[PDB]
Amino acid sequence: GLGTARLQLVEFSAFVEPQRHLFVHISQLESVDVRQIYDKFPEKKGGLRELYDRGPPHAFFLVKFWADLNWGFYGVSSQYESLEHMTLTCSSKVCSFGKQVVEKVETERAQLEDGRFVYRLLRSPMCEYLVNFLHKLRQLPERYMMNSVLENFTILQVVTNRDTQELLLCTAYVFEVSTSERGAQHHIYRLVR
Ligand SMILES: O=C(O)c1ccccc1Nc1cccc(C(F)(F)F)c1
Numbered sequence: 591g592l593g594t595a596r597l598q599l600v601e602f603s604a605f606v607e608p609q610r611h612l613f614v615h616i617s618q619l620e621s622v623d624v625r626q627i628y629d630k631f632p633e634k635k636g637g638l639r640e641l642y643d644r645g646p647p648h649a650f651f652l653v654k655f656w657a658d659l660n661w662g663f664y665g666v667s668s669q670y671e672s673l674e675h676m677t678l679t680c681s682s683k684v685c686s687f688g689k690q691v692v693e694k695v696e697t698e699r700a701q702l703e704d705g706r707f708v709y710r711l712l713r714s715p716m717c718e719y720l721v722n723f724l725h726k727l728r729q730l731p732e733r734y735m736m737n738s739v740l741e742n743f744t745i746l747q748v749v750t751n752r753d754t755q756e757l758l759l760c761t762a763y764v765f766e767v768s769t770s771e772r773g774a775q776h777h778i779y780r781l782v783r
Contacts, residue, residue, distance in 0.1 A: 664716035
């Protein structure tokens with residue numbers, strides 16, 4: 591599972607609507623050495639290397655997506671849950687060739703449902719930089735070219751307890767493209783050193 595004692599990812603998805611199309615989808619464990627990816631994110635140092643030093647290390651995950659790009663409103667939907675009532679800050683950074691080019695900061699209040707608290711961030715509009723980027727990527731004539739382009743782009747999500755500023759979840763994403771026959775796919779990994 592992608593999660594800690596305090597906070598779990600229930601569902602994640604990114605999509606376009608005119609019946610929607612999902613680029614990637616997680617509905618709800620191998621490891622990887624964070625040193626192998628230090629370079630994919632800034633040495634900002636709000637990038638990965640510094641965050642990991644201050645831990646906790648069990649809070650840090652890597653997701654590799656093989657996206658489905660064969661298909662307007664662009665959106666992202668996240669759902670988390672916990673047994674504690676919290677307020678969350680969710681920070682998402684896009685990084686391109688080592689440099690942070692987007693930062694999006696959102697908060698969500700716990701909601702009571704079925705004996706647990708859920709934190710629903712639903713249909714957030716995907717930022718414009720990403721929509722435009724996806725429209726170009728969609729044009730490329732060959733899957734191997736898309737992957738070459740995508741090798742230089744990563745996303746980092748940082749979820750903290752807003753009232754204590756404790757990190758609860760830190761997730762790095764990296765991306766390739768799948769063929770239409772093989773649909774979207776993901777693999778989740780703990781990060782270690
Ligand atoms: O959608 C935005 O505006 C977004 C902005 C900054 C950082 C991440 C963002 N969204 C996001 C976050 C995680 C994964 C994906 C996607 F999977 F769509 F690429 C998109």
